[PDB]
């Protein structure tokens, strides 16, 4: 079942696939999960915010 995403915290690759670390709205870091990029079609804006942030810091 589906939940609200507060933000994207980080990203990584494993096994040739990209995953993103999600802060779930209304929960704390103890509940943070890694999610396959495929699960995140409805997280356009939070993904972009994250990507821009990473780009800013380089």
């Amino acid at each position: 079942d589906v939940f609200e995403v507060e933000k994207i915290l980080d990203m990584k690759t494993e096994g040739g696939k990209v995953l993103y670390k999600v802060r779930w709205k209304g929960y704390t870091s103890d509940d943070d999960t890694w999610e396959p990029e495929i699960h995140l079609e409805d997280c356009k804006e939070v993904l972009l915010e994250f990507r821009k942030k990473i780009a800013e810091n380089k």
Partner: peptide, 12 residues
């Protein structure tokens, strides 16, 4: 609002 499936399983 931003939404997604939460993974409750994973590597064992």
């Amino acid at each position: 609002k931003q939404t997604a499936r939460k993974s409750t399983g994973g590597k064992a």
